[PDB]
Each structure stands twice: as C-alpha cells, then as structure tokens.
C-alpha cells in the first residue's frame, strides 16, 4: 500500500469534524469526512477513504473482519492515539448519537495551562476571523455554522486542484495551516479544547509516516495484530521514532560581525540566508527520507526538530547527510558556521508520556546535541583546515577572510552574493532554489530572490526547482513552500529614513527583544497531565507564528520607521529611527503580553547609535543591554532574575516594563506638555537639571539647593506647580526623572534628525 495514501489520509483524517459541524446531517464525523473526500474523484482509492473513515476503535471493529490486514488505517488510528497523549483515546466519536456535541466552541489558547503552577489556570479562546493574527480573549465566544460553511467552501475550492501525490503534500499542509489553524480538534468540555485541528492532524500525519517507515524496515505486515488486536502495549514499548535536532551554531558572528561601509544593508540578507539555509536543509533531508513537511515539528531560530523513523536506513541516510553538510559548511564557512545533527530513539510511550518521561526525550536530545557540539570536527578536518592556509595580501572588506575572494574586488564570494540578494530583497519577492542562482546552497544548489514572473519561466520547464514564498495565494496550484520570517523593512536605505524624521537627534535605534525562560516553559511550563506532541506543537507554532507573522503585521499596521533584521523564534533584531524603536518597544511588550496573556515575559535592550557606528558594535552593545535587562533583579534576596525589564541605551538604565511605561512615560509626557514654551535658555536649564540630578549622589545638600534654584529660574515659563512636581520627583524618583529628562532632550534636540 502506498505511503502517500497513508500520509494524505492521516492529514485528512478529521476532515469530517469541520464537515460535521459545518452542515446539518447528524452523522459520525468519520463517515461525513469520508463522503466529502469521496466527492473528489482524484481522492478516491479506498486507502484515503479507509484511513479517513476508520481511525477509531468502534469503526475499525465494525469492519476489521471485512477489511484485510496491513490496511493503512490501523496506522492512522494508532497515530491519532499517540498524538492525543493523555487525552481521550478510545471513546465515542464525534457525530455519533450517544452524546450532545457542541458544534460552536472555540479553541482555547495553549497559554491557559502554561506556567499554571505559578500563574494559574484560565479560560481564554480565539474568536473566529473571516492573517491577521488572532489574539486570545477572556470573553466566551462561539463559532457559528457560517464560519465552518465558509471553511468548507474554501476547502472545496482548494481540494479540486489537489492530488494525492508527493508534490501536493505541501499544498495540503498549507490549506490545513490556513483554514484549520483556528478550529478545535475536539469540541468536548471537561477537557482542554486548545489543540487545533491543524496541529493534531499534522502530528498524526508525522507519527503515521514514521510508524509506516518503521514497519517497512521491521518487515511487519500484520498491522491489525500488532496495533489493534491488542492494546499495542508491545508496540508502545518499542522505540519506533527518532527525534532529530538540527542545530546551527555561530549565526550571530556570521550575520552581525561585519565591518563594511555598507554593512547595514547586508544584515537582513545574512539573516535571510541563514533562515533559508536551515529550511532548505530540513526540506532536503525530508525528501531524502521520503517524508513530508509534516514531520518538521519545528523549524526556525537556527534550530529544527524532525520526527523520524527508528530504522537503519534512516540512520545511514542521516550519517551521509551529516557528512555532506559538514563538508559543505567547512568548504564555505571554515568554522564560522556549523550545523549539529543529533537524534535520540523514542517510543510511542515516550511521545504519549505514559511512562512518565516525555520530557526525557528532549533532555537526552539536548544532551546529544551538546555532546556533538563539544567535539565538532574529527582529527582530519582540523588537519585540512590548518593545511589550507595561505599568506595573503588581500582580505574581504566586511568578512575579513582571505579565501574565496573575487579577483577584481576584495570581498568574499558569500560576501558579494549577499550584497546582490540584498539588492534583490524587496517586498512580494519569492525565492527559487535551482542549479543556478546567487547564494550558494548545500548539495549543489543555488538560491535567488528573483521575482514571481521570472520564476514562472523557471519551473514550468525545468528539473528540481524549489519555490519559496512569504505569501501563498491560490494554495492548490502554483506549488510553492511558504517560509515565514520577520522581514518588515520600512525603507532599506537606512539614510533617507533617518533624514525623514524632523525633530529629535539623528540617531539609529536598535531593539533586541527576547522571551524570558522560554526553554523553561517548554520543559516544565505545561502541566504533566496535559503533555502531548500535539500540545507541544501548538505552543511552538503559537510562539513562532507570533514572532514572524505578527511582528510583520503589527509593524505594517502603522508606518513605523523600522527595518526588522530578524524576528525568527524567541528573538528580535530591529533597526530604525530611535524614536520609532522606543515607541514600538512598549507596543511590542503589550502585544506579547496580550498574546501570551501574561504567561511569558519579554526582555529588551534598546541601543542608540549614529548612522556610521559599526554594525558589529551596534549588535554587540545592544546584546549587552538585552543581557543587562535579563539581569534585572529588584531585590537581592530572591532566586533567579525577574527578567521582565528593558535597558534604555546603557546598562545602567535598566527598568522593568511596568516601571518604564508608567513612571518614565508619564514623566516624559508631563515634561513635554510643560516644557514646549521654554526659551533656548530653558534648554540649558534642563541640561543643568540633568547634571545636578546626576551629581546629587555625591552632593546631598548643595546640589539639591542648586536644583531648587534652577527650578526657581524655570518656574516662569513652566509654572510653579510643575516646578514643585519636579522638585518632589527629584527627591523621590530620581533615576526615572533623569531618564525622562534625557529622553526629552534627545527627542527635542534641534540638531537636524
């Protein structure tokens, strides 16, 4: 039996859930979905329909005698059971007449149970839409029949131009991601409804693919006996899966540690290059293992998790792939870039957490990845590295390397291709991976950011051309792969954008944000009872889609003068006008706090630099500020830092987000509303106020007296009440007052902008 039939049937196993709660027929969801897939002629080979119709115990039992063994729907049934976890496994099936099914419930947020040991449990849900990102709301909300009817008609539109083929699995997954992302996989209370249909179906398809490959390797042709005839205890015990850990190292040095004059333009190009490098490597290994995109549990942030089959063929392919990747990386980036490939053997009981140590999977996978990164190169790659050393009079302008140079220009080949693609990196461009291109890719491929029209005349007649796009319209036809990454660029010039603001200091703003303790949330944030691969995937997808897609959309909402370099996962690097960056920092904090409903906190560092400041030092300094914000600990009695802070332009100005917003911004607003009618002597008076406030520490009495005198001089164009307010602030909240005053001076500086 075909593996593609099993993959498609496992992806479309719960088609009948949306079908059933979209129409009015009152039948089992498996039957309704089987009929719906039967309505399409290309989706009719009885294997698709067997997987869709019979993936529950009662339905399988009703037909197991008539159906033959190794019939591919035992795999789908067991994959659904494994992906569910400690949730319902063998009970009544949706659409049956033994229960009253509520076809109108919304899916809960995965953050309802996240970190509930210290932040509590709550009941949020996603309101239905029709991008844009859907935020969770505490108000109880319902899904009308019209919502699922529109979903059904869009799915009918997409499925007409789809086939159960290898090249249409990505299109099927894109349909599912677009449509089922906000529908519950289970409309049953007394449980968590936070798992989407897309995440559940993707996990089921990945598990089914791995189980099928394992069975073919193990020479098992008795799926009934081995899975359903008993409770599959022996199968649940055996290690049938591999959890793999693509891990890229040295991205910070590769991207930001550059020194060209035009080094600000290439930051986005380098970030895009590394992101698409990781995506292409994962896709290449998947197609080498004859697996679908569904087996990528998570990709992004220089990291990829793949669910594989614990087979000898898979391990041999992994060894060959790792050797080829290591050789390619050493050839191009001697030691500056590295990808670590580790895997661990896991069983269905580990995935379902029945044995109690689902987290040991990732524990030992991280242990293996660290062990592999500790001993990267063998004692022949080091020898080759030292032997291929040459005395050179030339070196790269920004990459400062003496190899792979261009004969007419002191720049590296990667260093020139990145500048080229940065010139061709604009809005609404798609990415083509072919034998010819600009950026070098592993396995004898090259990548270009060429436009849509000149991509159509590249795949309509060619062999093995891969198209990657940020946005996919008409999901079925024009087969592409959707890649998500924060890439909002208000203006790529970085110079006219600065000479677009009229009031303020001519300074660039660098924002670097990072979620506090995301790894801890992935380890123990989810309660042990609600631990499953589907819930883990839902949380991962929530975080990744937030960062990439929602940062793009939020920055596009109002024309922020920001030039996002990287969003990816858990991190953020954006450069723009410092006032826009400062304004968007609080917006970012508030939007993240809404999206997570205050279950995770974010730390940021905001740097202020001139245009010609070195980009390597911008990155390093803003990273130091972000580390200082992560070091925030108001009391030296607690354990572990509070970490919910922001650093303003210097490691001494670390304030918590609440402190920043409330104190500093209300003080800045009052200062702005009371200082706009000061004379040019008043500006010097504010400068003297700042100097006196800074010196107060070493001058208790004389300096506070001088401050009182300065306020007396000022309280003719600002009023006596605000002079007294400033005096009270100076004796009570001084560092916040100094921060607000410095921000006001920099914002109102009349030295161009």
């Amino acid at each position: 039996m075909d593996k593609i039939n099993l993959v498609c049937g496992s992806l479309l196993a719960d088609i009948g859930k949306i079908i059933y709660r979209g129409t009015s027929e009152r039948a089992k969801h498996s039957k309704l979905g089987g009929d719906f897939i039967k309505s399409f002629e290309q989706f009719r080979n009885t294997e698709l329909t067997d997987c869709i119709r019979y993936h529950h115990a009662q339905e399988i039992t009703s037909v197991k005698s008539n159906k033959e063994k190794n019939s591919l729907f035992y795999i789908t049934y067991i994959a659904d059971n494994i992906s569910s976890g400690m949730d319902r496994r063998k009970d009544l099936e949706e659409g049956a007449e033994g229960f009253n099914w509520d076809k109108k419930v919304a899916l809960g947020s995965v953050f309802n149970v996240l970190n509930e040991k210290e932040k509590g449990r709550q009941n949020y849900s996603y309101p239905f839409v029709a991008e844009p990102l859907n935020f969770p709301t505490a108000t109880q909300n319902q899904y009308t029949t019209s919502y699922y009817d529109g979903l059904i008609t869009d799915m009918k539109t997409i499925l007409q131009r789809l086939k159960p083929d290898k090249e249409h699995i990505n299109s099927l997954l894109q349909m599912m991601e677009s449509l089922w992302s906000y529908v519950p996989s289970s409309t049953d209370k007394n449980q968590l409804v936070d798992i989407s249909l897309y995440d559940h179906s993707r996990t089921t398809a990945a598990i089914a693919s791995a189980i099928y490959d394992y069975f073919q390797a193990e020479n098992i042709t008795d799926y009934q006996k081995e899975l359903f005839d008993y409770n599959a205890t022996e199968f649940y015990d055996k290690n049938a899966f591999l959890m793999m850990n693509f891990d890229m190292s040295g991205v910070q040095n590769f991207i930001y540690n550059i020194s060209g004059s035009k080094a600000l333009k290439s930051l986005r190009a380098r970030s895009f290059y590394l992101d698409m490098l990781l995506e292409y490597i994962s896709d290449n290994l998947l197609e080498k293992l004859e697996l679908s995109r569904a087996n990528i549990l998570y990709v992004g942030g220089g990291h990829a998790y793949l669910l594989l089959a614990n087979t000898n063929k898979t391990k041999a392919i992994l060894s060959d792939f790792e050797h080829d990747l290591k050789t390619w990386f050493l050839d191009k980036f001697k030691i500056d870039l590295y990808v670590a490939m580790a895997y661990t053997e896991v069983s269905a009981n580990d995935l379902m957490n029945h044995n109690g140590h689902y987290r040991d999977i990732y524990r030992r996978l991280s242990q293996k990845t660290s062990a592999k990164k500790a001993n990267r190169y063998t004692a022949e790659e080091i020898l080759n590295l030292n032997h291929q050393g040459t005395e050179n009079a030339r070196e790269c302008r920004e990459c400062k390397r003496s190899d792979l140079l261009i004969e007419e220009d002191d720049i590296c080949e990667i260093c020139d291709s990145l500048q080229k693609v940065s010139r061709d990196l604009t809005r609404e461009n798609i990415f083509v991976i072919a034998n010819e291109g600009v950026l070098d890719m592993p396995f004898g491929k090259k990548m270009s950011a060429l436009s849509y029209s000149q991509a159509d005349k590249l795949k309509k007649s060619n062999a093995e051309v891969q198209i990657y796009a940020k946005n996919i319209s008409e999901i079925g036809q024009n087969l592409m792969t959707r890649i998500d990454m924060g890439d909002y660029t208000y203006r790529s010039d970085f110079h006219e954008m600065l000479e677009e603001v009229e009031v303020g200091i001519n300074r660039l703003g660098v924002l670097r944000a990072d979620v506090d303790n995301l790894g801890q949330a992935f380890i123990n944030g989810i309660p042990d009872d609600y631990l499953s691969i589907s819930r883990t995937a839902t949380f991962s997808r929530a975080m990744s889609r937030f960062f990439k897609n929602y940062l793009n959309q939020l920055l596009a909402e109002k024309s922020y003068k920001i030039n996002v370099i990287y969003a990816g996962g858990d991190d953020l690097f954006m450069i723009g006008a410092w006032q826009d960056i400062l304004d968007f920092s609080i917006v970012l904090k508030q939007k993240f706090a809404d999206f997570t409903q205050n279950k995770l906190s974010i730390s940021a560092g905001i740097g202020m630099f001139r245009e010609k400041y070195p980009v390597a030092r911008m990155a390093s300094l803003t990273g130091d500020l972000e580390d200082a914000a992560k070091d925030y600990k108001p009391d030296e009695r607690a354990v572990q830092a509070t970490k919910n802070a922001v650093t303003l332009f210097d490691a001494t100005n670390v304030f918590s987000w609440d402190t920043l917003e409330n104190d500093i911004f209300v003080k800045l607003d009052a200062i702005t509303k009371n200082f706009e009618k000061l004379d040019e002597t008043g500006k010097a008076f504010i400068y003297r106020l700042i100097d006196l406030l800074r010196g107060v520490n070493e001058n208790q009495q004389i300096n506070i007296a001088r401050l009182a005198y300065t306020l007396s001089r000022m309280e003719e164009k600002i009023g006596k009440t605000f002079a007294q307010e400033l005096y009270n602030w100076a004796n009570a909240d001084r560092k916040t007052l100094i921060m607000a005053l410095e921000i006001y001076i920099l914002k109102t500086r009349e030295r161009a902008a």
Binding site: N257, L383, E391, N392, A393, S402, A616, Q640
Partner: protein, 297 residues
C-alpha cells in the same frame, strides 16, 4: 606558580578581527609575539625561541583577576550529566569565567550561576572615536574598540619555572605596550612575578580531566589521540604580520586553528610553535603550546 599579574593604567585594545571591537583578555600567542618582538629589538630572538620550544618558558594566556580572585574561563566539561534537577549549562551559559579555586564547586554543582556573574565585574568596554585629519581633503573618521580595567582588576598569566630572559623581556614590554593601538595611548601596564602557593596546589594535583589553559594545537602525530573524549572549541588565529623587515608590504600570516583556552581533554598533549609565515625574510611564529590544569571528573 609564578603568576604574572598585569596592572593596566590605560584602556587596552585586544582585537579579535576588527579595530572597533576589543576583548577583555589576550591570548598566549599574542604575549609570545610581543615578547618575541621585544627579544628581536634587544637581539636575542633565537634564545627566547629556544627557551619557549624546549619548554623552559611556557605560559598560559591572560585571565582576569578581580581583588585577589584569579579567574579561569568556564571549562567545557562533559558534565551536566545530572539529568534530574538544577540548571546545568542553562544558567551556566552567560558565565564566561569561573574562579580558579571555586573550580571544584563548579565541577559538582552548587556554584551560583547568577552570583558568579555580578561578582565578576572588570572594567567596561568603550569605543574611541578618531579621525585622520586631512588638511585639504575631508577628514576620514575611524574608531578603536577599547577595554578599561578597574582599580583592583587586571590580567594574569600562569608561568611555571620563570626565566631571567622572560623577566627581562617583560620589563621591556612594559614600555612598549600590549594590544592593538599600543603606539597610541592603549598599551600600558605594570607587572609582578608574584609566586603563589594556593595556585601551585591546583597545578600540582593530578586528575582524569585536563583543562587546556592556553590556545594550543596538538601536533599531527598526537591530534588523533588528543581528540578522544575531548570537549573543545576550535578558534582561528591569524592577522597581519607585525614587523618592519618582512615582505616590504603588509601581508597576512597563515590562519592557524587551535583549541580555545577553556577546552578539556582526557589525553594530554604538548603543542608546538608553528611557523605561520614562510615567504618572508624572517620566520613568523604562532605559540600553540598546551597549558593544562588537571581536575577530577
């Protein structure tokens, strides 16, 4: 053993690859190049090279000391195998330097990851903004990355079995500087030999784990055995040759990839003085000898 304590009274520039960045320490090849340049200046480069190659003088690379607390880069240990609780290598990632005496606490856990970081406070980095003034053209700006040490803070180098020649070169190296823009106002230090007995206890002890304390490269006949249960990190060493009588033009030396000075090994190796310049008038050497601190793992 004979800790060379460096007290800097000016900001330093130790470049990794760029003039706009500075690192807080300098490597053992940097110190060896500085001492070899001093020896060439006073005319006994061959004696110093023979001393270094015959292991008469062998030194680690510079490490921070903060108020008689000698620090060591956080060793890359194969531990964290405590797979039940704690945060091994989780909060031990922003921790770059561990005290040399508190290394047994770090080995078995119990070292406070947070407290070891704010306690470690040596100076702070800065960027010096400069120009090349042109009388009629447009002045071209450039900037230098610098690090300024604190009052009771500096760098120290482990030297075992000090030599009169090493002490004589160290005295001359006081008045030439160390680091990048030393002919500008950046290389300036005072040194002491300062024999220590607490540190000698650590280095007289044996163990199953060898912490590499200087950037080293095992010879080809021993690299294979060095790479056996090793937990290392590979670092590129290179740059331009700094001499007056080499090639009549600025030329980069060959890139040498050595083991970073926090690596841990189970098999001991002794590196080599590698010649990374061969097409010029004089040899150019890259000190890659192994300095080891043994612990129990």
């Amino acid at each position: 053993m004979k800790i060379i304590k460096l007290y800097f009274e000016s900001p330093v520039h130790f470049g990794e690859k760029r003039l706009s960045e500075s690192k807080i320490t300098f490597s053992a090849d940097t110190l060896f190049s500085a001492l070899m340049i001093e020896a060439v200046g006073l005319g006994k480069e061959d004696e110093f090279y023979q001393l270094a190659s015959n292991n008469l003088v062998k030194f680690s690379d510079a490490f921070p000391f903060i108020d008689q607390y000698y620090y060591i880069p956080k060793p890359m240990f194969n531990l964290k195998l405590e797979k039940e609780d704690e945060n091994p290598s989780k909060a031990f990632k922003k921790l770059l330097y561990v005290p040399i005496d508190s290394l047994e606490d770090y080995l078995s856990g119990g070292l406070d990851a947070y407290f070891e970081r704010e306690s470690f406070n040596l100076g702070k980095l800065a960027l010096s903004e400069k120009v090349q003034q042109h009388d009629f053209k447009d002045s071209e700006p450039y900037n230098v990355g610098t690090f300024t040490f604190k009052e009771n803070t500096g760098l120290y180098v482990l030297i075992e079995q000090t030599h009169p020649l090493l002490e004589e070169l160290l005295e001359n190296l006081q008045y030439s500087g160390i680091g990048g823009k030393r002919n500008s106002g950046y290389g300036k230090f005072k040194f002491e030999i300062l024999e220590d007995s607490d540190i000698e206890d650590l280095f007289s002890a044996k163990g199953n784990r060898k912490i590499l304390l200087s950037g080293a490269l095992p010879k080809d006949a021993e690299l294979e055995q060095a790479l056996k249960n090793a937990s290392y990190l590979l670092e590129r060493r290179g740059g331009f040759v700094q001499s007056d009588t080499y090639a009549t033009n600025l030329v980069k030396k060959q890139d040498l990839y050595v083991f970073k000075s926090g690596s841990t090994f189970e098999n001991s190796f002794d590196g080599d003085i590698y010649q990374v310049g061969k097409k010029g008038n004089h040899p150019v050497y890259k000190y890659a000898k192994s300095f080891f601190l043994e612990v129990s793992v």
